[PDB]
PDB file of C-alpha atoms and ligand atoms in Angstrom:
ATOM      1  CA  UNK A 211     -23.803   2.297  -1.261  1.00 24.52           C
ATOM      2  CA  UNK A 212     -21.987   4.717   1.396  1.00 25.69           C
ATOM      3  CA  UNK A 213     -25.222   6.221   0.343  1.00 26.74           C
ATOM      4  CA  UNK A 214     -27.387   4.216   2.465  1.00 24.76           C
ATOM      5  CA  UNK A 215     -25.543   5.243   5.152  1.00 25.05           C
ATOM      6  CA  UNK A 216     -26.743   9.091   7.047  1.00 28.29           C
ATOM      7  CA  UNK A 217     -24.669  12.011   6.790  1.00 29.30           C
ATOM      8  CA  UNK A 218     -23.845  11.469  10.398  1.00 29.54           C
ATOM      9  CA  UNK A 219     -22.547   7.945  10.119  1.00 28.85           C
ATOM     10  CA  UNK A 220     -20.096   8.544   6.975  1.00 28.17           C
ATOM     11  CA  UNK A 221     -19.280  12.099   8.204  1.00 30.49           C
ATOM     12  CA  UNK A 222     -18.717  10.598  11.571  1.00 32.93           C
ATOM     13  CA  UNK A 223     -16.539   7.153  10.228  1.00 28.54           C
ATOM     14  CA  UNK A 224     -14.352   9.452   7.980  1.00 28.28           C
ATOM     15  CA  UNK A 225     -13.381  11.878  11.588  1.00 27.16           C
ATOM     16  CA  UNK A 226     -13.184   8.603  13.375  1.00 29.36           C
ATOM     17  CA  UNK A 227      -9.951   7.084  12.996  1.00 28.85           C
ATOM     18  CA  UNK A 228      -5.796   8.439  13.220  1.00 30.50           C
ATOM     19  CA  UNK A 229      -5.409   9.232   9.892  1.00 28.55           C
ATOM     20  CA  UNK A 230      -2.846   8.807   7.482  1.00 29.04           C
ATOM     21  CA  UNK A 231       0.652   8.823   9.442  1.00 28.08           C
ATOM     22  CA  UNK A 232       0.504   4.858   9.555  1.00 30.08           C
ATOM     23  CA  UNK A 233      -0.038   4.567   5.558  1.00 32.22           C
ATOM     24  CA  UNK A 234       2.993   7.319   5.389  1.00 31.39           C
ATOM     25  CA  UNK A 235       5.437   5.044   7.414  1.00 31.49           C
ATOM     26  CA  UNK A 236       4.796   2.222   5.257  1.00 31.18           C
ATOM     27  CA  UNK A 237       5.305   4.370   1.973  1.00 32.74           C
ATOM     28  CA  UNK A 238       8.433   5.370   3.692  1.00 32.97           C
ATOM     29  CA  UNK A 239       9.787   1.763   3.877  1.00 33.15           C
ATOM     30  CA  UNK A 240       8.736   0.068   1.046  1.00 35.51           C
ATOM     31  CA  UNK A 241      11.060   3.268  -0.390  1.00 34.79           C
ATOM     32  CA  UNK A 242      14.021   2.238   1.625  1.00 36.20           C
ATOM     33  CA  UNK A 243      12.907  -1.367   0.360  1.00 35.68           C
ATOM     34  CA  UNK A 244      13.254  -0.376  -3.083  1.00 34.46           C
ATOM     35  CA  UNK A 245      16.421   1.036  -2.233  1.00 37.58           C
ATOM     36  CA  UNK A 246      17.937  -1.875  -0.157  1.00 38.47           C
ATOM     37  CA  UNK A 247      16.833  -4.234  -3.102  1.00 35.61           C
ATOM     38  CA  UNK A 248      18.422  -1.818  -5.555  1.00 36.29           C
ATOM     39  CA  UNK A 249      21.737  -2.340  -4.131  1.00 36.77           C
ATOM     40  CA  UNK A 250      21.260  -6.090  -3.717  1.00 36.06           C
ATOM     41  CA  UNK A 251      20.697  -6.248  -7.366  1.00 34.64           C
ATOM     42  CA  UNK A 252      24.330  -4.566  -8.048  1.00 34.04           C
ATOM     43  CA  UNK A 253      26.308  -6.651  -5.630  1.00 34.15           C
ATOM     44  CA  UNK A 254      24.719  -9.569  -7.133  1.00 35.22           C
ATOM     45  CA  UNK A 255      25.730  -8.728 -10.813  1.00 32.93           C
ATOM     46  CA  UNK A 256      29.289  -7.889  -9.287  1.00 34.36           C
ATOM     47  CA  UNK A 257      29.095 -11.514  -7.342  1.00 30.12           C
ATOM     48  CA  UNK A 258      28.535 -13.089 -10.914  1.00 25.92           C
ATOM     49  CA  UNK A 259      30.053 -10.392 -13.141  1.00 21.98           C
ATOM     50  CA  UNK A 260      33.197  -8.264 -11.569  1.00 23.86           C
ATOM     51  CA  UNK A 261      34.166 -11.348  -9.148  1.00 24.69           C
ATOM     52  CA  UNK A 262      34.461 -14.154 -11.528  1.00 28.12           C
ATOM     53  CA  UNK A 263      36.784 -13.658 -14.683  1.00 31.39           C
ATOM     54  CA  UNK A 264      39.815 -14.292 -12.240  1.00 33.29           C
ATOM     55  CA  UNK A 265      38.444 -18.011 -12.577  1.00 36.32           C
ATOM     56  CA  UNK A 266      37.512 -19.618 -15.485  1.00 35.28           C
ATOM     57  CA  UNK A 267      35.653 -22.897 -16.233  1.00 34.75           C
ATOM     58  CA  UNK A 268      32.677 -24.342 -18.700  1.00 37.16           C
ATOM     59  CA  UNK A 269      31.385 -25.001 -14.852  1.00 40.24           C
ATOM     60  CA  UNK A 270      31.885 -21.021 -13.630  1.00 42.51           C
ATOM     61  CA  UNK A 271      29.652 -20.445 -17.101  1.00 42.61           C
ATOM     62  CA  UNK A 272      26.977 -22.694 -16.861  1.00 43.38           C
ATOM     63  CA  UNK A 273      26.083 -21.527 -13.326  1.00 45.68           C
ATOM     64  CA  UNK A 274      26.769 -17.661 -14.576  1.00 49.36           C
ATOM     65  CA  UNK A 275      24.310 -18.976 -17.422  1.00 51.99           C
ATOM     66  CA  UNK A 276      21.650 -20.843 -15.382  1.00 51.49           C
ATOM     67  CA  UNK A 277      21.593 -17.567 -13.143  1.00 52.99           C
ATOM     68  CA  UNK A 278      19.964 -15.244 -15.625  1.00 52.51           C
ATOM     69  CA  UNK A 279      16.393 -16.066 -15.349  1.00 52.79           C
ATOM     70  CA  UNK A 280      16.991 -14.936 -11.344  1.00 50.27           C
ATOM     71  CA  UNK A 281      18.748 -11.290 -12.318  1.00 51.73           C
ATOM     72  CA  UNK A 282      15.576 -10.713 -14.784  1.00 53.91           C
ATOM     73  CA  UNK A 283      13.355 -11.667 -12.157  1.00 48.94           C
ATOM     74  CA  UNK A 284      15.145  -9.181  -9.622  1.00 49.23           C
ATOM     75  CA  UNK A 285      15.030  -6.672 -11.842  1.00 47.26           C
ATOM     76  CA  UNK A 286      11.574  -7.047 -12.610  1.00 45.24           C
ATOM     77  CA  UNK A 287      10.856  -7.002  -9.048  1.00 40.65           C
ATOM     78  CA  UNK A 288      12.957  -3.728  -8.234  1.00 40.85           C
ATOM     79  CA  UNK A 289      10.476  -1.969 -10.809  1.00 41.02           C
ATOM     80  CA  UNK A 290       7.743  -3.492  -8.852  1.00 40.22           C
ATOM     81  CA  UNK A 291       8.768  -2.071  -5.360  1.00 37.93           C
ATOM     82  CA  UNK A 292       9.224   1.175  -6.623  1.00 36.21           C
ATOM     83  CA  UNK A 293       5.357   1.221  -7.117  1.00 40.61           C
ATOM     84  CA  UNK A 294       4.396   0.346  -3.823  1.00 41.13           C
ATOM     85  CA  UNK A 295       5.637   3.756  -2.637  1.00 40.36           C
ATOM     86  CA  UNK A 296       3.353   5.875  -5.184  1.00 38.70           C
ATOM     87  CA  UNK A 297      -0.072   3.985  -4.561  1.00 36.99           C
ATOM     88  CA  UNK A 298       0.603   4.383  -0.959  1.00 37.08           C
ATOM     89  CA  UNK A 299       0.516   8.037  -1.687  1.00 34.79           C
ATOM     90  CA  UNK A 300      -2.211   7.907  -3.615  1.00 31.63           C
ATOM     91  CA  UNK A 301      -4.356   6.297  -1.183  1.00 27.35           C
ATOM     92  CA  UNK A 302      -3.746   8.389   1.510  1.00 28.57           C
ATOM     93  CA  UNK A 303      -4.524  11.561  -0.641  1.00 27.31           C
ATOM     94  CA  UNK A 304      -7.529  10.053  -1.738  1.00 27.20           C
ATOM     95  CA  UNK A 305      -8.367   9.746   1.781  1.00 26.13           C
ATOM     96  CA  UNK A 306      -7.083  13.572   2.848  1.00 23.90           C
ATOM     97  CA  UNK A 307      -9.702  14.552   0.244  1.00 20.00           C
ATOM     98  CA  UNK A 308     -12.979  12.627   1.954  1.00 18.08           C
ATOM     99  CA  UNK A 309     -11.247  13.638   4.948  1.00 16.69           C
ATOM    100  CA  UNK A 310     -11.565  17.524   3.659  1.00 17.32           C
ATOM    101  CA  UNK A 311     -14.594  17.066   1.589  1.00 14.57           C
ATOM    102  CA  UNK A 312     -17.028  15.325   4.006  1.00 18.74           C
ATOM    103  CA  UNK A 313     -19.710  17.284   5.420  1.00 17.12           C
ATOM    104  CA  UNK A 314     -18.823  18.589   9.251  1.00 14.45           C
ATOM    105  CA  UNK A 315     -20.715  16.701  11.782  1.00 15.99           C
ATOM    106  CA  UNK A 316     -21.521  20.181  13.649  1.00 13.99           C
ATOM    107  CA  UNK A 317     -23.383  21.420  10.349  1.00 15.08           C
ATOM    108  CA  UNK A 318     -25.615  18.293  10.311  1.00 18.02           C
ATOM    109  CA  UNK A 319     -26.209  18.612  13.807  1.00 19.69           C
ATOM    110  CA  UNK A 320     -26.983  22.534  13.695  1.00 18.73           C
ATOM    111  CA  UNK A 321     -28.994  21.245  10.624  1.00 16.17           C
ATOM    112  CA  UNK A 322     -31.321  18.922  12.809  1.00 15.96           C
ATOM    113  CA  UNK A 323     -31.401  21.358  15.970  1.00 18.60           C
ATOM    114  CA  UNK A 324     -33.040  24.628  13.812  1.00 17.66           C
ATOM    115  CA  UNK A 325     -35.321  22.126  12.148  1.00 15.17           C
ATOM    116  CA  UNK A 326     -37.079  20.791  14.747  1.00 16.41           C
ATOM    117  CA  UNK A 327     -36.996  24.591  16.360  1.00 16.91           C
ATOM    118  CA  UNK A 328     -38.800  25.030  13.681  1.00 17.55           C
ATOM    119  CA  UNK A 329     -41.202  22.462  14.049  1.00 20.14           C
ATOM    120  CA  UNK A 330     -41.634  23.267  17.279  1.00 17.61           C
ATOM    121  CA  UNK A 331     -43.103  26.868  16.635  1.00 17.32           C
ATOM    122  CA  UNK A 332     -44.901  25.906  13.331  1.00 17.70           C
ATOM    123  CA  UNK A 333     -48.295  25.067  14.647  1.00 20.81           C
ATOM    124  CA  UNK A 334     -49.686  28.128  12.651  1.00 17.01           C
ATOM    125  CA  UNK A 335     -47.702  27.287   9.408  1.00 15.14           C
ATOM    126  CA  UNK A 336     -45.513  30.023   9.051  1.00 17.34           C
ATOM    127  CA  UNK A 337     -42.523  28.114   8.976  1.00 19.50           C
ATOM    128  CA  UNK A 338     -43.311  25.088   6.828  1.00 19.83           C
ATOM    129  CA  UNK A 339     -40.864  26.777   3.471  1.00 20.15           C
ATOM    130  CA  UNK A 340     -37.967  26.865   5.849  1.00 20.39           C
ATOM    131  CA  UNK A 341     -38.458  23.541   7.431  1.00 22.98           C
ATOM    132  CA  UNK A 342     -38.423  22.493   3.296  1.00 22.58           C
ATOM    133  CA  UNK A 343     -35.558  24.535   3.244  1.00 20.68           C
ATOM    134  CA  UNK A 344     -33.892  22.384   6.074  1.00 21.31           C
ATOM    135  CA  UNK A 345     -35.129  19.135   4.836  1.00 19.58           C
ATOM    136  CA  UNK A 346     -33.592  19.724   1.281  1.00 20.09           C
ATOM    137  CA  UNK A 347     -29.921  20.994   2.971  1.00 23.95           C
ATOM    138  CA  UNK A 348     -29.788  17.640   5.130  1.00 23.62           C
ATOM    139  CA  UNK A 349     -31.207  15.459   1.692  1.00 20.71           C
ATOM    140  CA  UNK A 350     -28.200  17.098  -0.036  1.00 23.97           C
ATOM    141  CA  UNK A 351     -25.570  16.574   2.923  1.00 24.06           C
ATOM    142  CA  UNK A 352     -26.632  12.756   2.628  1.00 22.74           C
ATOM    143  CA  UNK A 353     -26.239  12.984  -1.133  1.00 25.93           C
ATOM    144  CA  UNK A 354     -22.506  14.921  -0.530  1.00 27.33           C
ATOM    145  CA  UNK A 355     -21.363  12.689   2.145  1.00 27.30           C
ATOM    146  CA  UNK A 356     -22.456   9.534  -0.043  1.00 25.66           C
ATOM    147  CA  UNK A 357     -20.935  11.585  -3.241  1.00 22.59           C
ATOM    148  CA  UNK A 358     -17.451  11.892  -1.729  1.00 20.54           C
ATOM    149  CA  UNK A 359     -17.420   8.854  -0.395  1.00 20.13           C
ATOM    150  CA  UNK A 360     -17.960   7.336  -3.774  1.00 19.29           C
ATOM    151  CA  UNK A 361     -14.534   9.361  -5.345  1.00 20.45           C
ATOM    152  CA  UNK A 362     -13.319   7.991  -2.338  1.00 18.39           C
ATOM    153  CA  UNK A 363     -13.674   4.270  -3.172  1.00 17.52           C
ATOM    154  CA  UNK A 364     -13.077   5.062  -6.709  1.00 14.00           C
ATOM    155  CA  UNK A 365      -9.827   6.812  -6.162  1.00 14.74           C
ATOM    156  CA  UNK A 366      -8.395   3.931  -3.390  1.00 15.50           C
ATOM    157  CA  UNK A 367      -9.635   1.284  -6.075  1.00 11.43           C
ATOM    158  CA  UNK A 368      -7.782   2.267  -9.141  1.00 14.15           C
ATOM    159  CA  UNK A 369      -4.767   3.174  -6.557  1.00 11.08           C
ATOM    160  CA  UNK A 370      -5.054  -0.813  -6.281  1.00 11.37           C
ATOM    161  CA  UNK A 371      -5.669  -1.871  -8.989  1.00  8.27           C
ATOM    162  CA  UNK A 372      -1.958  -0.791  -9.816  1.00  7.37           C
ATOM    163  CA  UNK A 373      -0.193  -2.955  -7.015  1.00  9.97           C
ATOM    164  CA  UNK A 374       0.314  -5.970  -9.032  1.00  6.85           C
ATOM    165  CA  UNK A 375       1.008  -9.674  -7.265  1.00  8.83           C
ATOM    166  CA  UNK A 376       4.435 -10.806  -6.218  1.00 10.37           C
ATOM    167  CA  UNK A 377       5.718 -13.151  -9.064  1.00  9.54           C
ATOM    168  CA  UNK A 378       7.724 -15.962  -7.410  1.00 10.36           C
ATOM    169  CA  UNK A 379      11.408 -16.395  -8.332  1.00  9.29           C
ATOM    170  CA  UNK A 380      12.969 -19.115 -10.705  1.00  8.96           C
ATOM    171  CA  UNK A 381      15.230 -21.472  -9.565  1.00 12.86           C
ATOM    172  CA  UNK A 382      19.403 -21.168  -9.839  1.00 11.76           C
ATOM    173  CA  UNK A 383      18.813 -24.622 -11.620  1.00 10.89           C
TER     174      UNK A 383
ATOM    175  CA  UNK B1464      39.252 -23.347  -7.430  1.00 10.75           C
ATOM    176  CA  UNK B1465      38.662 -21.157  -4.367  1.00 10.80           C
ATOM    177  CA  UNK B1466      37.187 -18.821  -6.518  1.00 15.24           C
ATOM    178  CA  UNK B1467      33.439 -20.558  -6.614  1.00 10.56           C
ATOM    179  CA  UNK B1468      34.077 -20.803  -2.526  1.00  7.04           C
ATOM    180  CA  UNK B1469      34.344 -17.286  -2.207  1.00  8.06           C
ATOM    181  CA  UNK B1470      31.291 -16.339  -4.625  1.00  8.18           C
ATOM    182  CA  UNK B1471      29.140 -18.873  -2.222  1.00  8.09           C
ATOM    183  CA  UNK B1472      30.093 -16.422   0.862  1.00  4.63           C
ATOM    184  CA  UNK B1473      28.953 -13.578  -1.433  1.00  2.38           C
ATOM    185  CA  UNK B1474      25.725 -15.089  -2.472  1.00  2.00           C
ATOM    186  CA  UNK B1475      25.159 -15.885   1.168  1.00  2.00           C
ATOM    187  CA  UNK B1476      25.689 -12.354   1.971  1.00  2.00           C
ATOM    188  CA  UNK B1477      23.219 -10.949  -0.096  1.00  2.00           C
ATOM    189  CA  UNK B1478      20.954 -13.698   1.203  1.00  2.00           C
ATOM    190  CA  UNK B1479      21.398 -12.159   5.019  1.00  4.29           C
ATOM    191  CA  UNK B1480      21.154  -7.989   3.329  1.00  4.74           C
ATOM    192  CA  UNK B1481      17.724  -9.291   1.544  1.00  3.02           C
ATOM    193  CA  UNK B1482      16.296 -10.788   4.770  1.00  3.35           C
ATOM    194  CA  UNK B1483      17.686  -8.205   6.872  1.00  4.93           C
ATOM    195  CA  UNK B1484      16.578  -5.381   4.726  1.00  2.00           C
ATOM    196  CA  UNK B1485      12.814  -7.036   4.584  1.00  2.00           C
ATOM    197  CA  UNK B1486      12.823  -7.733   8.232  1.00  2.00           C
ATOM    198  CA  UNK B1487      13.418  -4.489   9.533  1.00  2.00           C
ATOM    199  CA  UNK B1488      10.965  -2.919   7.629  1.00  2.00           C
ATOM    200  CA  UNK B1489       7.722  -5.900   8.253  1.00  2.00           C
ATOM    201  CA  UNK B1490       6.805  -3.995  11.259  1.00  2.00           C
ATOM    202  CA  UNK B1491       6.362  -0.492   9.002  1.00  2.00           C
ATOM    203  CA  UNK B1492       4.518  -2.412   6.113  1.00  2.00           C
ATOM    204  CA  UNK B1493       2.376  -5.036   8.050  1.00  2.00           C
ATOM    205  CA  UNK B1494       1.229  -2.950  10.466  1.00  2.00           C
ATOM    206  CA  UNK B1495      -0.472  -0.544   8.247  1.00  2.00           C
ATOM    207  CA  UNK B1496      -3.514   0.826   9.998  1.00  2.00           C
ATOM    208  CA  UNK B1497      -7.023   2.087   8.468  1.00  2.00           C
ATOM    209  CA  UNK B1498      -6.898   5.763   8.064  1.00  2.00           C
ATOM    210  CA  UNK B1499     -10.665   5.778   9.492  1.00  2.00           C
ATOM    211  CA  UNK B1500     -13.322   3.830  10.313  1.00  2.00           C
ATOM    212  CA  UNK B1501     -14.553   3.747   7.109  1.00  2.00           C
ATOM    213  CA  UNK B1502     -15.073   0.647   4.626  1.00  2.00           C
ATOM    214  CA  UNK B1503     -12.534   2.172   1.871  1.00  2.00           C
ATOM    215  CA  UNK B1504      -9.860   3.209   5.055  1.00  2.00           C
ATOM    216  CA  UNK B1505     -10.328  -0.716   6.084  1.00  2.00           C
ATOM    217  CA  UNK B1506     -10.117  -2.052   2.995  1.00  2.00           C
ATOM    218  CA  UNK B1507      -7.000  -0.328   1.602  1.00  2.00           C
ATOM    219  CA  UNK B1508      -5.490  -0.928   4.797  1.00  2.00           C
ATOM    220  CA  UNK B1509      -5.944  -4.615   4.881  1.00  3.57           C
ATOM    221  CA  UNK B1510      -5.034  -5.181   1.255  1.00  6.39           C
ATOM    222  CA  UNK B1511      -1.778  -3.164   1.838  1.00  6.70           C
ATOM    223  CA  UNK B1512      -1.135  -5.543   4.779  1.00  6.36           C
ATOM    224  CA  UNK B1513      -1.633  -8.620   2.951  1.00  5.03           C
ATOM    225  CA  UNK B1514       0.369  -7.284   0.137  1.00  5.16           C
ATOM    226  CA  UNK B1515       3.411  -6.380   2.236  1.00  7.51           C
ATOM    227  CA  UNK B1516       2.758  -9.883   3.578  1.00 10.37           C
ATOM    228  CA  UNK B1517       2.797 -11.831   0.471  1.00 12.27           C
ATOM    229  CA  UNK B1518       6.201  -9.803  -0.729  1.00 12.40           C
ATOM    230  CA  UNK B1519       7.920 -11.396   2.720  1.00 10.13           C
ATOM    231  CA  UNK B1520       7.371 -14.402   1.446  1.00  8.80           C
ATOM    232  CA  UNK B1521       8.137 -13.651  -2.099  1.00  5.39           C
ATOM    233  CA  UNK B1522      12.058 -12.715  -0.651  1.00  6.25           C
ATOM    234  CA  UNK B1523      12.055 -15.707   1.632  1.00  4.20           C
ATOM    235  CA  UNK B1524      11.756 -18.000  -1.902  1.00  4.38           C
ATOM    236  CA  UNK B1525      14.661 -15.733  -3.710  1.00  6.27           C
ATOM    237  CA  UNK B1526      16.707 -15.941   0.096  1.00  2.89           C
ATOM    238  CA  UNK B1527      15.960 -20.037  -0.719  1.00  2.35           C
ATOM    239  CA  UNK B1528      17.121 -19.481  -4.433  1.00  2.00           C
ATOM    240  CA  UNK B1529      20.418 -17.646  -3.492  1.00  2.00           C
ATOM    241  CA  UNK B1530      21.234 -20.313  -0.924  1.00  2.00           C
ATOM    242  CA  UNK B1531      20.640 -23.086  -3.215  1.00  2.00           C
ATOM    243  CA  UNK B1532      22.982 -21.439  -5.657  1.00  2.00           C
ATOM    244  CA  UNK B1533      25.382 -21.199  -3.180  1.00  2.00           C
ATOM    245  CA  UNK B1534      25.189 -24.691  -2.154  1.00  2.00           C
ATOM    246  CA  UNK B1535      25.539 -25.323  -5.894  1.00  2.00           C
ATOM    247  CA  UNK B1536      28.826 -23.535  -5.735  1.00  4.18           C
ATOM    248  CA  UNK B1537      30.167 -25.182  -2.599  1.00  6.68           C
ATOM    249  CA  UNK B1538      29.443 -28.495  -2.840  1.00  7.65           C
ATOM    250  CA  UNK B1539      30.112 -28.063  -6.935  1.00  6.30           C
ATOM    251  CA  UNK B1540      33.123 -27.570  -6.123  1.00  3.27           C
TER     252      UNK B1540
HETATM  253 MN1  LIG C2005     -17.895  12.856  -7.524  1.00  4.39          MN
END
């Protein structure tokens, strides 16, 4: 319920912070993460592939052998890191949107000014439609605010939902 | 055989380019701020944090694995 909240509190929290660039440097490194990780894959299969035949041994093969639950798992977790990355971004253009979407705080306030201008000259009655007419604009900037807010928890939710937990590794017997 | 000697320096290796590699990006991926102030901002932020947490100790086990597989090559040998 961002919906219990007033159009100046979610409009206001939603302005409030320094937006995305923090989210974006993150998204950035898990990348070079995925990368790093990448290459640590390869130079391990060469460590137990390409640098080995020169030596041979039932010994050199069960160790080559007890290593392949390990490669699985790295490669498992490579897939997993190049996720990371992509929620990030979805996030943070989940949040441009409420950012965009959200009702400016100076049209709620210029809202609540002319209304009670209004009510202040409406001793005879002749403004009573257009005070309605305020009343229902600030109902329905509640009703946006809450509304986008909403998409935005939706959105960020699914986003992760997707980031799945960090399986541990098996042993090298 | 030297061979299993030299494939323990390797394994080591890729121990220290893991760690290093996770290392010098912890202070990109734990310090993930809240967009805004928010409860979605916060939350996504946190989880993010706690999830970039739980992965640096997800690569400290494998570093542990690799250097018990070197061991296994050194000392079986
Ligand atoms: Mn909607």
């Amino acid at each position: 319920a961002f919906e219990a909240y007033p159009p100046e509190v979610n409009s206001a929290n939603i302005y409030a912070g320094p937006g995305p660039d923090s989210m974006l440097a993150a998204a950035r490194a898990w990348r070079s993460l995925d990368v790093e990780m990448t290459a640590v894959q390869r130079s391990f299969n060469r460590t137990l592939l390409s640098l080995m035949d020169a030596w041979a041994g039932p010994v050199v093969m069960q160790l080559m052998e007890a290593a392949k639950p390990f490669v699985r798992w790295l490669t498992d977790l490579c897939v997993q890191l190049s996720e990371v990355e992509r929620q990030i971004h979805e996030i943070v253009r989940a949040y441009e949107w409420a950012h965009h979407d959200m009702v400016p705080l100076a049209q709620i306030y210029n809202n609540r000014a002319e209304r009670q201008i209004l009510i202040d000259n409406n001793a005879l009655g002749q403004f009573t439609a257009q005070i309605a007419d305020l009343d229902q604009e600030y109902d329905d900037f509640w009703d946006e605010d809450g509304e986008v807010m909403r998409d935005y928890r939706l959105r960020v939710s699914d986003a992760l939902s997707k980031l799945t937990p960090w399986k541990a590794p098996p042993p090298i017997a | 055989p030297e061979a299993l000697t030299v494939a323990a320096t390797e394994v080591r290796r890729i121990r220290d380019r893991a760690i290093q590699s996770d290392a010098q990006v912890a202070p990109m991926t734990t310090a993930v701020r809240p967009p805004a102030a928010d409860l979605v901002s916060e939350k996504a932020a946190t989880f993010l944090v706690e999830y970039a947490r739980k992965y640096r100790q997800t690569i400290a086990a494998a570093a542990v694995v690799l250097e018990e597989f070197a061991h296994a090559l050194t000392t079986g040998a």
